[PDB]
Design brief:
part of a larger assembly, 7 chains, A alpha+beta, B mainly alpha, C mainly alpha, D mainly alpha, E alpha+beta, F alpha+beta, G alpha+beta, E: alpha+beta, about 35% helix, globular, RNA-binding, myristate (chain F)
RNA sequence: CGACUCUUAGCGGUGGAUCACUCGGCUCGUGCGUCGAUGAAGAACGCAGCUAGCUGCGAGAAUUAAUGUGAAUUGCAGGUUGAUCAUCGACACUUCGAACGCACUUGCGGCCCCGGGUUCCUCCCGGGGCUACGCCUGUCUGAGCGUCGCU
RNA sequence: CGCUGCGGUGAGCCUUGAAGCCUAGGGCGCGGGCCCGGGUGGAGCCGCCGCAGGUGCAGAUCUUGGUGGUAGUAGCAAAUAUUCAAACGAGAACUUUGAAGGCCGAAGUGGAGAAGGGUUCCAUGUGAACAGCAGUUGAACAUGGGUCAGUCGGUCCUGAGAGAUGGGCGAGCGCCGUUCCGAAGGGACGGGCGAUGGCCUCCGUUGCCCUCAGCCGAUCGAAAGGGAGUCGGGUUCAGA
RNA sequence: AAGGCUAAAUACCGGCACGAGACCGAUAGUCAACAAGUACCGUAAGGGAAAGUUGAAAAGAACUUUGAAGAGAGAGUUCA
RNA sequence: CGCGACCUCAGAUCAGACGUGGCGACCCGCUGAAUUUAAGCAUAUUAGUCAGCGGAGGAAAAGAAACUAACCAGGAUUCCCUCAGUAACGGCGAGUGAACAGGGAAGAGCCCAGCGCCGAAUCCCCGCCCCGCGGCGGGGCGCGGGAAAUGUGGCGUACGG
């Protein structure tokens, strides 16, 4: 009865969508994300899984505010200036 | 691996030996022909031209 | 479930608008290799996680 | 009329708004034409209207900002919008003046023992 | 031989920069030579090809002495459509066969304010090469 | 001292490592003090500390902090080195006077195992094959 | 109407009241399965919605 | 001769080896060596005339301005006083997130200011700005049979 | 002998056809192998002297991919049962309508929900694939549609519990602990003073002083517990 | 000694931007030459593929004919 | 009692600031194994290594001797060659293992406290004036406020002053 018959009683989710990493690993009873440790201020990352690191690092997302820094850097972060008008 | 022994060192006197044997063979027309150089009309094999 | 949260309902909305076939005119583009949508999810086979 | 931003910057403020909602109105009824099965010609116009609304909004925002940073020109404290945003790390560095500060003792060395320009003979 | 260390000679890099060049670079790569009668009139070798330029095809199945204006410059395909250079499709409609600009000689240019200032510059720097060398 | 935080003793290793009780921390209790005062006031910079009293269960230290963004500190050329970003959290990296002593560095034959920057710097340079091009 | 998903019944009521110069009895809203919010706007009896639809173009 | 079975060859299938290609890797080297409370990395959801993914972008949403460039974009439609690309210094940048009014249901507040609502008369509605923790200098208000002084 | 790349060399080969592959063709070598002919193919390749190696397969219950024999075989047998006619249609044991015969038999094969699923709902259209026969049918596919609340739930409350701050511990991320080592109330009434707004009437608003206070553990924790208040009739292809 | 600062020579499998190679050539080389950390699997931590090539140019087979259609027979395109 | 100092200690959505999180190849501080080797194994070895925790920078750390030496003496740190698989450690088994001198790369030195002198001669902030004002700084004027005698600044640090 430990097999097929016992898979019928599975109708209670333990995890749900974490609102910090978006993964479906937010344990409801423990109120902690098993993927990023959401209530903890610091992100959950371990060196014993190099493959899980590169899945979620600084180059995997949009970098919507960092890819602009790389561009502004190659001009010295100039500010308040405009190209000379026509 | 990258730390395979890529480079080799040769004794300095052996390097200088080979350059002497290389130049000395450049003065024999039979050896320069055998290298395939079409030199059948060159006036003199150790060809020397003025510094102009 | 008939009792949903606004997070869940908005999530199911996205996975429903993504389940459509590719439009006919895209493989008339020049550098187009796409033959069909390879991410079509059927509600009975693939169970969307959650 | 192809709305160009060269033509907006000379206008007074509250008439730009009178032109803004005018395009807002025209975009709405263009959206209505999209569901009522409108002509292909009008459907291609909503992109022109959308980018024209962005233009007038851009002029409004720009002219408003430069009026602000002209009002906060000589003031000590200014809103965080108008302070130069450049890589928080270098917002913390010392000024162009502080890093040039030398102690009275260190200044006295430079006056007394300046590095000479010399050359040794063969 | 090239000595500039910052200019690549890699085959894969040159082909990648060629097939992914942006539009304003596509324009330059799609340049065509001028006719002999135009080459000594402007003292200019070649020129990027515009939408309405008289044209002779020199290579290929459509080569000949006919003059034909360009109708469109399909920069995405690295190709131009010349007015009379067309073939019959199956259902009786004609389609413009595409010709590569390098295989095309310009017989008459589409002059305008921006075009003329290009011709003079290509001629101004051309003289520098003959006044500095001689 | 410092007892090994393992549940009920259980150091599942070889007998050389069964120690639980008479283990000593590698850093002084004064260096632990500088760390706790610096971790709480992250905005400040630890400068030094000194002993002010002890008993059977407590040691009391007074840590000297500097606020590196006060103009009295910022505009003074003698002390504006503390403002540089390289001196963020000197106590966490063991650069204060009390912290340096636990690193075992100094000149002479007594301190050979830290020639180089530190104890790890020596270990690297001594356990690195210098595979030259020509060998 | 397909209103924005953020708007209230109060914001929807004063919007149609201002965009089309009409008076509203009540507004019922639901969020469609695709995501956008649909609003049934019941006009006051002194306004005939059939002609109001012709001014805005839907018919 | 049959049928069946076996062998060989031609042809045809099945299958995708081989060969030839290569906008991808791998390795070495060079220069630089720059994230974030002015809201980062990451996540979510949106945005195209016809668009699901990828890519780009943020309600100004496959982008605005500016400058350079100088006639396209293109799958199909539609429409030089600057099309399109590139650059990018102005402007803008939804919701989560160190995440910051309190909670995490998007749920309840509080304060101040405007507009309807009044005709400030309390409401109600909308809008705007605030409302996290630690810590520094300073200010204000305080506490103490702490140490004192004067009445 | 053979494979791959590199330095030399062959005034080498090649769209008048390279590599590769096929071959009842002609041959060479003891052999590893190789050279010709023919066919196919469509763009590169080889000889010689040196150099370099991720260099030669029949096996490893080898790895990946592909294909056989078995084999048109085992099998498509749990829960009594189908029949006639018609319609649509290229096509009907299976769809639809009608009739007949049956079953579930109210602890249902009925009518509604929770959890879970997530568009499967509804309509039109198609018959490639899928629905282990078939299909004119479908929960398949393609287009479109569809979920409306002061009163029904959530929201509020606390439960077992979870969990911040103070504090304590801890190398440290943090942990312990939940009233315990705490200056833990930002409220209220009245009075007094000053001030304003509207017919500064009288009231509201505000500041200051005085007066009072048991609060007592932030916060989270139930779509079955606690919890004010909606019922009748009608209406859709699908919501009441 | 028990207080403090300090460039250069040095390190750099991440990042930005480049160059190169006696390297691999689609079962190789990164897991990933392609809508790849994607599809998919697992409650979760995590695990994790396969998949390059028409032609110079779509010129991608009009039209006739059999069939309900898929599919054929002609014709046509192309050096093929 | 009242009033005022001062010292301790609170509260503020007080005025202005600052810290948190990410990346982590390189770097600094801790923590820290066991496979394995010893043909068994417990010390040793693996190894101050992996994992774990904290903190940075464009480099970090180190660094101007409480040094090396015993010479006729050298003279901050770091890096390379060598010293050297050496001295030494080690069930003296397996194994482990530096330094000085020498040659190079680079080369740069300095500041306090204290001890004393100078009438606090010093610093922060607000208000006004001028100069620039996208690194809010310079000068001036304030019987303007505060810090500071429980010690600010100048001189001066072992090479002596």
């Amino acid at each position: 009865t430990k097999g097929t018959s016992s898979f019928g009683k599975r109708r209670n989710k333990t995890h749900t969508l974490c609102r910090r990493c978006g993964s479906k690993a937010y344990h409801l009873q423990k109120s902690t994300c098993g993927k990023c440790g959401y209530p903890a201020k610091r992100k959950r990352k371990y060196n014993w899984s190099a493959k899980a690191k590169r899945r979620n690092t600084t180059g995997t997302g949009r970098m919507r505010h960092l890819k602009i820094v790389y561009r502004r850097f190659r001009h010295g972060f100039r500010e308040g200036t405009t190209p000379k008008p026509k | 691996k990258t730390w395979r022994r890529w480079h080799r060192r040769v004794n300095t006197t052996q390097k200088r030996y080979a350059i002497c044997s290389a130049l000395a063979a450049s003065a024999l027309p039979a050896l320069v022909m055998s290298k395939g150089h079409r030199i059948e009309e060159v006036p003199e094999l150790p060809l020397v031209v003025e510094d102009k | 479930s008939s009792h949903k949260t606004f997070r869940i309902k908005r999530f199911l909305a996205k996975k429903q608008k993504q389940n459509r076939p590719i439009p006919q005119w895209i493989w008339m583009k020049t550098g187009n290799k796409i033959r069909y949508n390879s991410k079509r999810r059927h509600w009975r086979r693939t169970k969307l996680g959650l | 009329a192809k709305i160009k931003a060269r033509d907006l910057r000379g206008k007074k403020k509250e008439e730009l708004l009178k032109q803004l909602d005018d395009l807002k109105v025209e975009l709405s009824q263009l959206r209505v034409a999209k569901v009522t099965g409108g002509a292909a010609s009008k459907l291609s116009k909503i992109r022109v209207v959308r980018k024209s609304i962005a233009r007038v909004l851009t002029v409004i925002n720009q002219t408003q900002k430069e009026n602000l940073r002209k009002f906060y020109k000589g003031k000590k404290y200014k809103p965080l919008d108008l302070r130069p945003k450049k890589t928080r790390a270098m917002r913390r560095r010392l000024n162009k003046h502080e890093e040039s500060l030398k102690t009275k003792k260190q200044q006295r060395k430079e006056r007394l023992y300046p590095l000479r320009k010399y050359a040794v003979k063969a | 031989m090239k000595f500039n260390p910052f200019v690549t000679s890699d085959r894969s890099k040159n082909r990648k920069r060629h097939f992914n060049a942006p539009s304003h670079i596509r324009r330059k790569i799609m340049s065509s030579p001028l006719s002999k009668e135009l080459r000594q009139k402007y003292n200019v070798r070649s020129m990027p090809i515009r939408k309405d330029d008289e044209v002779q095809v020199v290579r290929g199945h459509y080569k000949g002495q006919q003059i034909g204006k360009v109708v469109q410059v399909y920069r995405k395909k690295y190709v131009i459509y010349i007015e009379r250079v067309q073939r019959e499709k199956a259902n009786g409609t004609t389609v413009h066969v595409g010709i590569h600009p390098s295989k095309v000689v310009i017989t008459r240019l589409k002059l305008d304010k921006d075009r003329k200032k290009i011709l003079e510059r290509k001629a101004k720097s051309r003289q520098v090469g003959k006044e500095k060398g001689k | 001292g410092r007892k090994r935080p393992v549940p009920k003793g259980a150091t599942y290793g070889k007998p050389v490592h069964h120690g639980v009780n008479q283990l000593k921390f590698a850093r002084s209790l004064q260096s632990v003090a500088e760390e706790r005062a610096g971790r709480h006031c992250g905005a400040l910079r630890v400068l030094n500390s000194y002993w002010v009293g002890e008993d059977s269960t407590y040691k009391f230290f007074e840590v000297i902090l500097i606020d590196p963004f006060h103009k009295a500190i910022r505009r003074n050329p003698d002390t504006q080195w503390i403002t540089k970003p390289v001196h963020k959290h000197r106590e966490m990296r063991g650069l204060t006077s009390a912290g340096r002593k636990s690193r075992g560095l100094g000149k002479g034959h007594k301190f050979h195992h830290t020639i180089g920057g530190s104890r790890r710097a020596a270990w690297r340079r001594r356990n690195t094959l210098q595979l030259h091009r020509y060998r | 109407f397909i209103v924005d998903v953020k708007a209230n019944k109060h914001q929807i009521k004063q919007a149609v009241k201002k965009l089309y110069d009409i008076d509203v009895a009540k507004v019922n809203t639901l969020i469609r399965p695709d995501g956008e919010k649909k609003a049934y706007v019941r006009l006051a009896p002194d306004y005939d919605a059939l002609d109001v639809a012709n001014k805005i173009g839907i018919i």
